[PDB]
Design a binder for this molecule. Structure first.
Ligand SMILES: C=C(C)[C@H]1CN[C@H](C(=O)O)[C@H]1CC(=O)O
Ligand SMILES: C=C(C)[C@H]1CN[C@H](C(=O)O)[C@H]1CC(=O)O
Lengths: 258, 258
């Protein structure tokens, strides 16, 4: 049967083509994950249909209800057969779905509006004039929450009680906040998005310091899925033959606007 | 039963303590992987015994005999229950044993003796005065062999026919060759070892350019192993709680001699 792929609109992984209203099926989308999905299906011998996750979320479990939302939820409840998106491999998600080995490596980073007097997380922790936060859901927020690490602890304690909220709903919101806060807001996000945005007009943002940790994005399938093993080998095969780095340069730097 | 862990002597992952002749059991060893093994066993609730792989190899399959050697072979033939070492996650190995998600991220890098007029793989490819090669077995050699990539292809073609051989048997051999060749030999090795050696006396080596690819080291277990699932979750748990980065700084930079 045709494999149902769930994904999410996040640049430059999956984006609607400018003329999407005139197209149908998979041709309506473009991006790193759209190309990766084609390669995975090709190497695994299956036909597929790209779909955008119904609730527009990545995947977290609600306290109290214990229900999984986002792409993870669609896999958990059988609404989709595979998730191909910038879904960070985490302990809680690994417990309910299967992840392929990383197709992309990344780490938590700091985004500032050019000119902001901040060079590291250390600088952020030892001050409050410049507010800073993470996405309101996701692996970055969890990193600070579970962090023994010192400077990261002063940061989580600060972010948790900061008013107004320093957390943003999406990457677009965090970037807009950095750009419109005249240097008074720094956004903690994954290096992949940071590096991408740095090469997009208005070219007014910058990634500072080194990554705070090392993690990866993985292709997800429901536990005990037949396609799981084949997809994992496909990711390794594509990475070893340079397809993945070629794909990143295509969507990150070949398209640089700065 | 006590879990048999197979590992390999590779600095600073596993090293014999200076006074090892006076110790017994696991206390004879020290290093990043020795500490990681303790953490994995603790989080997985098992007793273990560290052993050094009999043939002193990582794991490759012989053509003609089709027999697996090294740590991979010990897992494949049931001589060990788990491998905890800087074993690169690769397609061919993933097909015969199970790998946990990466406990360390790395990429192929270039090591030169300080002063060598080389800054990138591109520089290496467009010349021959300065010889360069990889370890005679392993994932780095395979990267160049399977590389479509252009400059990397000119490099593999050159390395394959270069005389005398530009390939080295071990990290120690590659480093000794770089140090004793008066700038006429550059070694292609994993960034982890490169970064480590750069901070070790004589402090005469340097890592140049950016990594050529992105890969990781994983903990290995025989296929269908009971411990596999638990070990994978332990790696993710330890990484999220900062144990892994803390462990890398302990063995890489806290001990810097330069
Ligand atoms: C864009 C979002 C909400 C994602 C993408 N990867 C992370 C995840 O899969 O949780 C989230 C980012 C972050 O947490 O910084
Ligand atoms: C040190 C050795 C021989 C190893 C360690 N990781 C790689 C592996 O697991 O193949 C090899 C290095 C390399 O290929 O550059």
């Amino acid at each position: 049967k045709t494999v149902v792929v769930t994904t999410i609109l996040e640049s430059p992984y999956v984006m609607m083509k400018k003329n999407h209203e005139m197209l149908e099926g998979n041709e309506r989308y473009e991006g790193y994950c759209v190309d990766l999905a084609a390669e995975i299906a090709k190497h695994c011998g299956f036909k597929y249909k790209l779909t955008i996750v119904g609730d527009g979320k990545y995947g977290a479990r609600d306290a109290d209800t214990k229900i999984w939302n986002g792409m993870v939820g669609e896999l958990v409840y059988g609404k989709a057969d595979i998730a191909i998106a910038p879904l960070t491999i985490t302990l809680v998600r690994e417990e309910v779905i299967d992840f392929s080995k990383p197709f992309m490596s990344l780490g938590i980073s700091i985004m500032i509006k050019k000119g902001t007097p901040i060079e590291s997380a250390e600088d952020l922790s030892k001050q409050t004039e410049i507010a800073y936060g993470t996405t309101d859901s996701g692996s970055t927020k969890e990193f600070f929450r579970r962090s023994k690490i010192a400077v990261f602890d002063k940061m989580w304690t600060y972010m948790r009680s900061a008013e107004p909220s320093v957390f943003v709903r999406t990457t677009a919101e965090g970037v807009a906040r950095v750009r419109k806060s005249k240097g008074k807001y720094a956004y903690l996000l994954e290096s992949t998005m940071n590096e991408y945005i740095e090469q997009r007009k208005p070219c007014d943002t910058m990634k500072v310091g080194g990554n705070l940790d090392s993690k990866g994005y993985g292709i997800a399938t429901p536990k005990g899925s037949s396609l799981g093993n084949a997809v994992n080998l496909a990711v390794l095969k594509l990475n070893e033959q340079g397809l993945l780095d070629k794909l990143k340069n295509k969507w990150w730097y070949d398209k640089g606007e700065c």
